[PDB]
Amino acid sequence: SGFLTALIQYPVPVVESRADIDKQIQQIIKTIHSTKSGYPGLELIVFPEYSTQGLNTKKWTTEEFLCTVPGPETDLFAEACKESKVYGVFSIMEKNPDGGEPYNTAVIIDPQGEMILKYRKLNPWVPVEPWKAGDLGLPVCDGPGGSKLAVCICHDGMFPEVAREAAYKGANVLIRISGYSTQVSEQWMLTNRSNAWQNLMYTLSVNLAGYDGVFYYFGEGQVCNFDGTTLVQGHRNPWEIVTAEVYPELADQARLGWGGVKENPYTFVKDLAEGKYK
Amino acid sequence: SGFLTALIQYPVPVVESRADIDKQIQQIIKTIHSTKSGYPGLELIVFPEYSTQGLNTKKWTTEEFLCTVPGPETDLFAEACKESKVYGVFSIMEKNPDGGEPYNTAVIIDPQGEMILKYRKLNPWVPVEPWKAGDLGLPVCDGPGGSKLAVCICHDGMFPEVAREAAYKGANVLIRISGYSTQVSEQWMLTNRSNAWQNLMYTLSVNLAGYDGVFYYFGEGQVCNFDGTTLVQGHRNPWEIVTAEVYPELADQARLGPGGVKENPYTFVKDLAEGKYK
Amino acid sequence: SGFLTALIQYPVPVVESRADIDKQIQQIIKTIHSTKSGYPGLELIVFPEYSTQGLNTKKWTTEEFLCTVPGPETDLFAEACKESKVYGVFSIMEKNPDGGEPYNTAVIIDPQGEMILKYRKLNPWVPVEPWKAGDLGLPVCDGPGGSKLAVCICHDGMFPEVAREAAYKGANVLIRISGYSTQVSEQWMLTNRSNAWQNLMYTLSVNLAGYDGVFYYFGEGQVCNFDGTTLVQGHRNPWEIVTAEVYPELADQARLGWVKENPYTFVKDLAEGKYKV
Amino acid sequence: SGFLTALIQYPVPVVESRADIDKQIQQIIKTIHSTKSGYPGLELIVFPEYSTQGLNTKKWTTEEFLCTVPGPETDLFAEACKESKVYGVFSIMEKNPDGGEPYNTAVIIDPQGEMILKYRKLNPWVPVEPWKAGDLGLPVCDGPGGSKLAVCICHDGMFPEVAREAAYKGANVLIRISGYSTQVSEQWMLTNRSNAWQNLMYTLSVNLAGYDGVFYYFGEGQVCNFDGTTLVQGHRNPWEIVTAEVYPELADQARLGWGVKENPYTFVKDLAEGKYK
Amino acid sequence: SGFLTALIQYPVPVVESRADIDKQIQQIIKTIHSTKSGYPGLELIVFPEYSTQGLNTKKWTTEEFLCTVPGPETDLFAEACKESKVYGVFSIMEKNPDGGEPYNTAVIIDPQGEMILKYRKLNPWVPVEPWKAGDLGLPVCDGPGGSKLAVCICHDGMFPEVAREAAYKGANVLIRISGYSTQVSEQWMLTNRSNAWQNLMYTLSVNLAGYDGVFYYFGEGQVCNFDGTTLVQGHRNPWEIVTAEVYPELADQARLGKENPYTFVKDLAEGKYK
Amino acid sequence: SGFLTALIQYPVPVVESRADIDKQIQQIIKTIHSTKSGYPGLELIVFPEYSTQGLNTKKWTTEEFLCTVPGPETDLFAEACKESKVYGVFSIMEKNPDGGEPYNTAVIIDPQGEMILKYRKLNPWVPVEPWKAGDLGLPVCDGPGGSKLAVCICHDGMFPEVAREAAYKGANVLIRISGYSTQVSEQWMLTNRSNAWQNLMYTLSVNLAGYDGVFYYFGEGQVCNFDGTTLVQGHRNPWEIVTAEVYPELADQARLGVKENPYTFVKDLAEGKYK
d(CA C44, CA B76): 45
**Neighboring chain E residues of D250 at a CB cutoff of 8 Å:** 247
d(CA B19, CA D46): 71
Strand partners, D174: D150, D203
**D109 with D115: CB under 8 angstroms?**
yes
Active site residue F121: yes
Dihedral Cα F62, F66, F72, F74, nearest 10 deg: 170
For residue C67, give the 3-state DSSP assignment: strand
Nearest CA in chain A to D220: A235
Read off the CATH number of the domain in which B114 is found: 3.60.110.10
Report the phi/psi class of residue F21: left, alpha or beta, with left for phi > 0 and alpha for psi in -120 to 50: alpha
**D5 with D45: CB under 8 angstroms?**
yes
Q: Name the catalytic one among E36, E95, E118, E121.
A: E121
Pairing relation of β-strands E241-246 and F87-94?
unpaired
The DSSP element (H or E) to which F245 belongs, if any, is strand F241-246
Report the phi/psi class of residue B106: left, alpha or beta, with left for phi > 0 and alpha for psi in -120 to 50: beta
* Burial class, A27, CB count within 10 angstroms (exposed 0-12 / middle 13-18 / buried 19+): middle
CA Rg value for chain E: 18
Last residue before each break in chain C (C–N > 2.5 Å): 258
**CB pair distance less than 8 Å for C228 and D187:** yes
- Residue B151 C-alpha from the chain's centroid: 5
Q: Name the catalytic one among E67, E141, E152, E154.
A: E154
d(CA F229, CA F251): 13
Resolution value in angstroms: 2.2
d(CA F167, CA F150): 8
Specify the length of chain C in residues: 277
**Neighboring chain F residues of D245 at a CB cutoff of 8 Å:** none
Domain containing F145 equals 1-275
Q: How many CA atoms lie within 13 A of A58 on its CB side?
A: 7
**Neighboring chain F residues of D239 at a CB cutoff of 8 Å:** 210-211, 216
Q: Which residues contact D167 (CB under 8 A, 6 or more apart)?
A: D174, D199, D200, D201
The CB-based long-range contact list for B72-76 (8 Å cut-off, 24+ gap) reads B73/B21, B73/B25, B74/B107, B74/B109, B74/B115, B76/B25, B76/B29
Helices marked H in chain F: 18-38, 72-84, 160-168, 185-198, 248-256, 264-270
CA Rg value for chain C: 18
d(CA C83, CA B213): 18
Q: Which residues contact A62 (CB under 8 A, 6 or more apart)?
A: none
Q: Which residues contact C127 (CB under 8 A, 6 or more apart)?
A: none
**Count of C-beta atoms within a 10 Å radius of residue E134:** 24
Give which of B157, B163, B145, B18 is closest to B93, Cα–Cα.
Answer: B18
For testing contact with chain D, the best of A237, A241, A243, A245 (most D CBs within 10 A): A237
**D68 with D94: CB under 8 angstroms?**
yes
* Burial class, F224, CB count within 10 angstroms (exposed 0-12 / middle 13-18 / buried 19+): buried
**Burial track E135-152 (b if 16+ CB lie within 10 A, e otherwise):** eeebbbbebbbbbbbbbb
Active site residue E154: yes
Nearest CA in chain C to E236: C236
d(CA A35, CA A42): 8
Experimental determination approach used? X-ray
Supply the angle between the helices E18-38 and E72-84 in degrees, to the nearest 10: 10
Strands (E), chain D: 3-8, 42-46, 87-94, 103-109, 115-120, 141-142, 148-153, 173-178, 202-207, 209-211, 216-218, 222-224, 230-233, 241-246
Nearest CA in chain D to F237: D237
Output the furthest CA–CA distance in chain C (Å, rounded).
57
d(CA F57, CA F72): 23
Total beta-carbon pairs less than 8 A apart between chain A and chain F? 32
**Neighboring chain F residues of D232 at a CB cutoff of 8 Å:** 186
Neighbouring chains to B with at least 3 Cβ pairs closer than 8 Å: A, C, E, F
Phi, psi of E136, rounded to the nearest 5 degrees: -115, 15
Q: How many independent structural domains does chain B possess?
A: 1
**Count of C-beta atoms within a 10 Å radius of residue E126:** 10
Active site residue F267: no
**CB pair distance less than 8 Å for D273 and C271:** yes
Nearest CA in chain F to B245: F254
User: Any contact of A with F, at least 3 CB pairs below 8 A?
Assistant: yes
Give which of D97, D155, D87 is closest to D125, Cα–Cα.
Answer: D155
**CB pair distance less than 8 Å for D241 and F186:** no
Neighbouring chains to A with at least 3 Cβ pairs closer than 8 Å: B, C, D, F
Helices marked H in E70-203: 72-84, 160-168, 185-198
**C174 with C152: CB under 8 angstroms?**
yes
d(CA F105, CA A146): 62
Strand partners, D105: D92, D120
d(CA C160, CA C200): 13
Total beta-carbon pairs less than 8 A apart between chain C and chain E? 31
**Neighboring chain B residues of C28 at a CB cutoff of 8 Å:** none
Pairing relation of β-strands F173-178 and F148-153?
parallel
Q: Name the catalytic one among D121, D132, D220, D224.
A: D121
Q: Name the catalytic one among B49, B73, B94, B165.
A: B49
d(CA D232, CA D240): 12
